[PDB]
Structures are given as structure tokens and as C-alpha cells.
Amino acid sequence: QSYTNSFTRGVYYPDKVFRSSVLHLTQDLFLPFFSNVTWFNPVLPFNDGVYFASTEKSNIIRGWIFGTTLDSKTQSLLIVNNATNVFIKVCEFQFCNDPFLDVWMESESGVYSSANNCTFEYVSNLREFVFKNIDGYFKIYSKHTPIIGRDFPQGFSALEPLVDLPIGINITRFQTLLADYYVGYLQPRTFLLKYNENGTITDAVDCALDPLSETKC
Amino acid sequence: TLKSFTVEKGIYQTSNFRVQPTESIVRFPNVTNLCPFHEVFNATRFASVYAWNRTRISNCVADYSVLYNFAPFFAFKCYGVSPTKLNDLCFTNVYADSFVIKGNEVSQIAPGQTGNIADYNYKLPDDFTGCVIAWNSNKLDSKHSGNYDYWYRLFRKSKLKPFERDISTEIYQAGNKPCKGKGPNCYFPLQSYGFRPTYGVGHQPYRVVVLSFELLHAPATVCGPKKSTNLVKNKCVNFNFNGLTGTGVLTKSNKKFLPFQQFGRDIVDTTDAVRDPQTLEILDITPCSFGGVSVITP
Ligand SMILES: *[C@@H]1O[C@H](CO)[C@@H](O)[C@H](O)[C@H]1NC(C)=O
Ligand SMILES: *[C@@H]1O[C@H](CO)[C@@H](O)[C@H](O)[C@H]1NC(C)=O
Ligand SMILES: *[C@@H]1O[C@H](CO)[C@@H](O)[C@H](O)[C@H]1NC(C)=O
Ligand SMILES: *[C@@H]1O[C@H](CO)[C@@H](O)[C@H](O)[C@H]1NC(C)=O
Ligand SMILES: *[C@@H]1O[C@H](CO)[C@@H](O)[C@H](O)[C@H]1NC(C)=O
Ligand SMILES: *[C@@H]1O[C@H](CO)[C@@H](O)[C@H](O)[C@H]1NC(C)=O
């Protein structure tokens, strides 16, 4: 594991309101410009949301698990994007420590060991996700820009909201489910977002980075 | 306005004119996901009262008015809020109960009541907010030989508490001596019914859905269903779109929204545009004409 910098990555649509050719000064939880990003199965904390980037070719990433203690005594959220449809299941799954399958078969979901109440269920190249939790709602935003090359592209990409869910649970620890990735932590900030003719976010400016990027705000 | 009876020459300002609305438009989203309580109300077999199924109802739209006509509920008692208020608060983690009990027993399923079933089988709290519904089931829960498949508790060395379920099958003790097996004062605390199609009205089986439902509060609030009306364009109307309420004229537009957006806003705050949840068409909202009504006198 190493430490790198995120140029201008992590900017997403804050709300579901259309705006045409404008500049909006908003306050929200974001990933600060040029913050320190952990580059990587340890357990990582969940401070007011996380930003997860993944780059792979072998498709080893298979999902995520979230919870407060993961002791099978409090509700845990499992997201598995196996091969065709994504399964979201919210309960006290008795997960195994290391769910790994050799290599065909595409079976044997022995990730968990026992079942419980299980209230909520749901079905449906530089993959970037933002996971936020607020007001009892879990919000997952995603973007998939096919990388042209092999380095990390310092560029701007807005993240459209993939799903908003009323799971209504509590989460403080999150892990990763395997068969390179980047982890960053969000903070409250104020941003200036630029909107084209088509309610697309094309550029963003922070308001706590530099002297110039405060006079701009 | 001038507070005088002698108006001189000039153009005097006066009241204001507005174009008042004439219709009301309400357009809630497509009505797709609703629960087939068909599985909850039209099943072949139900559970015994001692092992009552706490049926879970979630993630759908409340449409049980067909059950008003398809199933003529002879019993309908609601001790909580009025049904007319059910649109203000909906339910997501709501529970339902399925009972198969006798005839002269539906009166015992009521708050503050006493009896064998109320004390040993199913006890409701004093502050009970729910609806009891019952209906006769001779045609599908009675048999000439006898429906020996529904059981009920008779003996227990304690009283019950609101919303408690017991499945215990251990023998009941009545005397001082320790007990191993039946025989003497040591009875089995489970006894079945003997429903037949030719019983009297008070002994025929009643399928009793004690909708002891509530559990309204939840991060999610799957709701009851809303009525929608038609849409009127090029006219001054009072509109309500998914909780956004206003007045104006809804004309055709050419803005290219993105698939995840609902409303639109101008440079300041105002809801310039909107998207209809059903036909998925951009609609421009323009405010009603208003201004001054100035007067010219010589
Ligand atoms: C993380 O990156 C920031 C850049 O803003 C730097 O100031 C900080 O020292 C870094 N932390 C490390 C390398 O441990
Ligand atoms: C359902 O929830 C209750 C309490 O929340 C728990 O005691 C019970 O074990 C759960 N059911 C299962 C099958 O785990
Ligand atoms: C908006 O979408 C249209 C779709 O044809 C595209 O031509 C245009 O370039 C986009 N952006 C602007 C600046 O309007
Ligand atoms: C839902 O959308 C379909 C698509 O045309 C339409 O046929 C149907 O009538 C809509 N339902 C409602 C509630 O109007
Ligand atoms: C209740 O559960 C039993 C099994 O425990 C089942 O046979 C019966 O059909 C169920 N009835 C209802 C009310 O769904
Ligand atoms: C459902 O039950 C009602 C109750 O009488 C009945 O009228 C209706 O035909 C039933 N529908 C089906 C298909 O089970």
C-alpha cells in the first residue's frame, strides 16, 4: 500500500435538479482537491462516506460488505455484482473472512455461513464509485470511463447517481470482496460547479485549496 | 384610492390584476409496484392461532379495495386512526396476522378483552391501533370428516403479553409430584378444532385476518396509492408534480434533460421546467400574467 494524490477526481452531482449553462456554489461532502489517496485484505474505516476507484482486467473485484461491527449481531450490507445482475442484501450475514474462488463454474456463494431476518433485497476500466450514507439513506454513485492507456488520467469526470436506497442501517467499517484499487475519505467542503447547455458538469473549483480558488468562489 | 370626490387630470395608479386559475392537475408517478395480498388473502391454507403467521408486508402500493368487493368482509373494526388519514402516513415494515378461529370468538379479539384465546393464544395491547377483519370460511375450511389441522393453546402456567408467540410442546404440570409423560394430572397443552360444514353460525370456522398492522415509521415508507388525473396544457392551472406545487401554464419544451433528473431551476431559484412522471416529456412552466390596471381620466 502506498500514498498518491487525486488531481480533480470525485466530483458528482449533488442533487437531481437540472441547470443550464450556470455556475453553482454548493456545500456538500466531497473529496478535497489533491487529498491523499491510499493505493492498494485489511478493514478500513468509514468516515462520512468513501470514494473507491478500481482498475483491473481480470475482474477480481466482486463486491463490498459494510457494517458497524460485522459480528452477526447488527445488520450488514452486502453488494455482489457477480456476472449479469447486482444483488443487494441487507442483514446479519455470517460472512467468511476470505471469500475466494479458484478461477467455468460461477457458483458457490459460500461467502456467508448463516441467514437471518434479511429485510431488504434489491436486484437490477477505471470504475469509480462514491458511497455516501446520510439521513438513513445509502446513496451509490458510479462512473465508468474506458481508460485509453495504462496510467492514471488526471481528468474531470462527473459521477451520475446509480442508486438511492432506504436501507436505514448503520455502518462504520467497510471491506472489499475479491474473486489495483484506490480508497479516499470525504469531508465537508464548498465547491463551485460549472454547467454546460446540457446540465453536464464540466469543471469544478474548490474553495479552500488556494488563494486563487477562494476569490474565484 | 385618492380619498377624495374630485379627481384631477392624469393617470392614477390603482389595484393590480391577476389571471386566476381554473383547473387543478395532480400527476403522481406510474402506479407500478403494489403487493398481491392475493398471496396474503387468497391462499389455500393458513396457520393455527397458536402458531399465527406474522406475515410481512413491504415494498408495494396499498390496493385492497378489490378485497372490498371480492371478499365481503363482514367484520371490520379499526381502533386506531381513521382510514382517511392513511394517506398521510404509509407503512414499510408493517406486520400482518392470519388467524383461523371459531365463530363466537371474533368479539374476544379486541383491546381490553378476556377469555381463553385472549389470555393464552393471542393478546392485544390496550393501545391497539389496527383493524380486525373476519369472514366465514365454510366453503374452503370445513370438511365432512373434520379439519384436524388447526390447533389452539388451552393450558399455560402464566398469562401472555402483547405480541408474544409460543411454540412450546412440553407437558403441563398440575400437581405437586414431578412429571414424566401423560397419565395423571399432566395434560398436553395443545388441542385441535373439529370444523364441519354443517356447524352453526357460532361454531363455523372464521378466517380472521387480525390486521394488527402498524410499524409505520422506517427509513423507507412504501406508500398507499395516489390518484392521478389528466394533464392540461396551454392553460392556467394549479399543478402538483411529486410534491412540487405551483400555478402557471405548462407548455411544450425542448430542453434536453438527463435521464436521472426530475425538475429544472433558473438562475435564481424558480422551477422553470419540469418532467411529467408518466409520459416522460419536458414541460416548461411559465407564470400567470399579472400587472397593473392603471386608470386614465380627464
Ligand atoms: C498525503 O498527501 C498530502 C498532500 O495534500 C501530504 O501533505 C501528506 O504529507 C501526505 N501524507 C503522507 C505522504 O503520509
Ligand atoms: C429476527 O430478528 C430477531 C430480533 O431482531 C432475532 O432474534 C432473530 O434471530 C431473527 N431471525 C433469524 C432467523 O435470525
Ligand atoms: C448537448 O447535446 C447535444 C445533442 O445533440 C449536443 O449536440 C451538444 O453538443 C451538447 N452540448 C451542448 C454544448 O449543447
Ligand atoms: C405507465 O407508463 C405506460 C407507458 O406508456 C403507460 O402505458 C401507462 O398507462 C402508465 N401508467 C399510468 C399510471 O398512467
Ligand atoms: C402459515 O404458515 C404455515 C406453515 O408454518 C403454512 O402452512 C400456512 O399456509 C401459512 N398461512 C398463511 C397465513 O400464510
Ligand atoms: C380472491 O378471493 C376473493 C374472495 O371471495 C374472490 O372473490 C376472488 O375471485 C379470488 N381471486 C382469485 C383468483 O383467487
Side-chain angles (χ1 to χ4, degrees):
Chain A
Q1 59 269 6
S2 310
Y3 298 84
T4 52
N5 64 85
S6 48
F7 177 47
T8 43
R9 291 250 162 196
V11 190
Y12 62 91
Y13 294 84
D15 54 352
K16 301 193 180 176
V17 179
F18 178 87
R19 297 184 173 96
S20 44
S21 295
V22 291
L23 281 86
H24 196 235
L25 186 89
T26 181
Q27 162 193 351
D28 210 343
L29 307 158
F30 286 116
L31 182 79
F33 274 7
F34 303 97
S35 62
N36 203 309
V37 188
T38 47
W39 167 26
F40 296 168
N41 190 18
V43 182
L44 278 298
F46 194 102
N47 321 299
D48 59 48
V50 294
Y51 170 86
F52 189 110
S54 56
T55 57
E56 85 291 330
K57 59 174 186 286
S58 302
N59 307 305
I60 311 298
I61 310 300
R62 283 319 176 202
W64 308 264
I65 51 170
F66 306 83
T68 44
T69 57
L70 302 98
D71 55 352
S72 75
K73 307 179 195 155
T74 55
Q75 289 280 102
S76 289
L77 164 66
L78 167 60
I79 306 175
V80 59
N81 191 12
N82 48 7
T84 60
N85 56 4
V86 62
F87 290 141
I88 303 170
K89 321 181 66 170
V90 189
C91 47
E92 296 178 354
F93 282 122
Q94 192 90 61
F95 286 127
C96 66
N97 298 18
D98 285 294
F100 64 96
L101 276 80
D102 194 48
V103 190
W104 306 278
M105 304 310 297
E106 294 285 334
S107 175
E108 195 177 0
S109 173
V111 184
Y112 63 97
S113 173
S114 71
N116 66 296
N117 304 116
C118 296
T119 71
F120 196 90
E121 169 74 79
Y122 186 95
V123 310
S124 77
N125 282 312
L126 196 76
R127 277 171 260 252
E128 55 185 2
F129 294 83
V130 171
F131 306 124
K132 205 206 304 197
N133 187 10
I134 173 166
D135 303 314
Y137 273 93
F138 200 74
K139 325 196 175 298
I140 297 178
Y141 309 157
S142 68
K143 184 57 175 299
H144 174 99
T145 59
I147 176 65
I148 309 176
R150 277 165 298 174
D151 280 330
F152 191 75
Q154 315 274 269
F156 189 76
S157 189
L159 283 84
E160 303 200 354
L162 171 64
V163 75
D164 284 352
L165 295 174
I167 58 160
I169 72 165
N170 199 0
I171 297 163
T172 65
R173 284 199 302 155
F174 88 105
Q175 301 190 37
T176 303
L177 293 200
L178 294 172
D180 279 325
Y181 65 99
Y182 297 70
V183 169
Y185 294 91
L186 266 48
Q187 288 180 356
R189 297 291 183 184
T190 302
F191 273 63
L192 195 59
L193 315 163
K194 180 176 178 183
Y195 280 77
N196 207 5
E197 307 189 2
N198 305 356
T200 59
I201 303 182
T202 46
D203 194 18
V205 164
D206 205 328
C207 302
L209 201 65
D210 316 300
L212 198 45
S213 64
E214 204 188 320
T215 75
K216 271 195 264 197
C217 304
Chain B
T1 287
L2 290 177
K3 300 295 292 296
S4 62
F5 285 2
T6 61
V7 189
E8 317 309 311
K9 187 191 315 305
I11 169 168
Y12 293 104
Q13 209 67 41
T14 187
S15 40
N16 297 113
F17 82 94
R18 311 176 186 270
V19 180
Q20 66 189 0
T22 177
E23 293 100 13
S24 179
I25 294 311
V26 184
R27 293 270 286 176
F28 280 116
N30 220 291
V31 197
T32 59
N33 190 17
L34 62 80
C35 270
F37 326 104
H38 199 80
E39 280 82 17
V40 176
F41 289 77
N42 274 27
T44 307
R45 300 267 282 200
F46 279 170
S48 294
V49 60
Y50 89 97
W52 48 281
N53 291 332
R54 173 134 278 190
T55 300
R56 166 69 188 255
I57 315 300
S58 49
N59 287 73
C60 53
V61 171
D63 180 20
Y64 68 103
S65 60
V66 290
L67 294 154
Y68 291 167
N69 207 50
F70 273 119
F73 299 153
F74 89 99
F76 184 87
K77 271 82 70 175
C78 295
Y79 301 98
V81 298
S82 302
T84 56
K85 307 294 286 183
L86 283 180
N87 284 7
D88 291 331
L89 287 180
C90 296
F91 316 98
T92 290
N93 195 356
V94 61
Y95 295 147
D97 295 335
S98 76
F99 293 6
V100 177
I101 67 185
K102 290 174 63 175
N104 49 20
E105 183 180 331
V106 63
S107 65
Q108 206 181 130
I109 311 292
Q113 274 289 336
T114 57
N116 194 75
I117 305 301
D119 293 354
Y120 299 122
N121 294 259
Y122 189 74
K123 180 64 171 172
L124 278 175
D126 292 330
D127 47 350
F128 160 68
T129 59
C131 307
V132 177
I133 281 170
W135 68 82
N136 198 292
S137 63
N138 274 279
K139 59 188 75 66
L140 61 83
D141 283 330
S142 314
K143 208 185 295 183
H144 296 288
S145 61
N147 220 35
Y148 289 141
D149 53 355
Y150 289 119
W151 307 78
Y152 81 99
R153 185 77 64 111
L154 195 56
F155 296 133
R156 168 175 191 82
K157 55 175 181 180
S158 178
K159 300 289 94 176
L160 269 296
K161 72 178 66 63
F163 312 104
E164 195 180 1
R165 176 197 273 95
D166 44 348
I167 298 89
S168 177
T169 55
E170 284 81 7
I171 49 175
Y172 180 68
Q173 197 189 340
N176 287 319
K177 57 184 180 294
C179 191
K180 294 180 289 296
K182 65 186 297 296
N185 274 196
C186 275
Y187 311 122
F188 198 54
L190 274 180
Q191 206 164 10
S192 63
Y193 282 133
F195 295 130
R196 309 268 171 81
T198 187
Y199 277 169
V201 188
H203 288 266
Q204 291 158 10
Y206 291 166
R207 265 182 179 208
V208 180
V209 186
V210 180
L211 269 179
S212 49
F213 73 104
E214 183 178 2
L215 299 109
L216 295 52
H217 62 297
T221 59
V222 48
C223 295
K226 301 155 297 175
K227 188 213 59 171
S228 174
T229 192
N230 294 346
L231 168 75
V232 183
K233 290 184 285 183
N234 276 283
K235 288 182 66 184
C236 173
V237 297
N238 298 300
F239 61 90
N240 185 324
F241 283 170
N242 299 269
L244 192 146
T245 62
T247 313
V249 177
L250 316 176
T251 63
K252 293 179 179 179
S253 168
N254 48 359
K255 303 176 181 189
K256 284 188 296 293
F257 272 21
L258 272 76
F260 64 96
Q261 285 157 339
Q262 297 297 109
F263 306 109
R265 277 209 184 126
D266 71 330
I267 56 170
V268 182
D269 211 8
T270 73
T271 58
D272 274 23
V274 75
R275 157 183 277 183
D276 289 345
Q278 280 173 19
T279 51
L280 266 73
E281 171 72 76
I282 188 64
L283 288 177
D284 265 1
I285 298 176
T286 175
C288 317
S289 59
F290 63 95
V293 74
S294 185
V295 179
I296 296 97
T297 187

